[PDB]
Design brief:
This is part of a larger assembly, with 2 copies of chain A.
Chain A lengths: L5 E3 L18 E2 L13 E2 L2 E3 L2
Antiparallel strand pairs in A: 1-4, 2-3
């Protein structure tokens, strides 16, 4: 399997056209805020392909 | 796309804003493709002993 390519799952807001996003912060979906511990309702945005 | 438009004008006044009217011409258009939030203009200092 090729694990050298990643994709961003979700984002909080939108993006402008002709814009590259390089933010690898911990995504927050709902409550229980993350602050870099990756607990409940804390999913990583970059996920591996298949 | 970050666009810079330049013009030089040989004024001769003491202070404040000069009068008159002129146009603006392009110099370069660099397609960086990123947004800019804040900017700061850096000056220089003269050093002597």
């Amino acid at each position: 399997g090729n694990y050298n390519y990643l994709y961003r799952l979700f984002r909080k807001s939108n993006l402008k056209p002709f814009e590259r996003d390089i933010s690898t912060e911990i995504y927050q979906a709902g409550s229980t805020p993350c602050n870099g511990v990756e607990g409940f309702n804390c999913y990583f945005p970059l996920q591996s392909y298949g | 796309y970050f666009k810079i438009y330049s013009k030089h004008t040989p004024i001769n006044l003491v202070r404040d804003l000069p009068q008159g009217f002129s146009a603006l011409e392009p110099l370069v258009d660099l397609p960086i493709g990123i947004n800019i939030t804040r900017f700061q203009t850096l000056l220089a200092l003269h050093r002597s002993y």
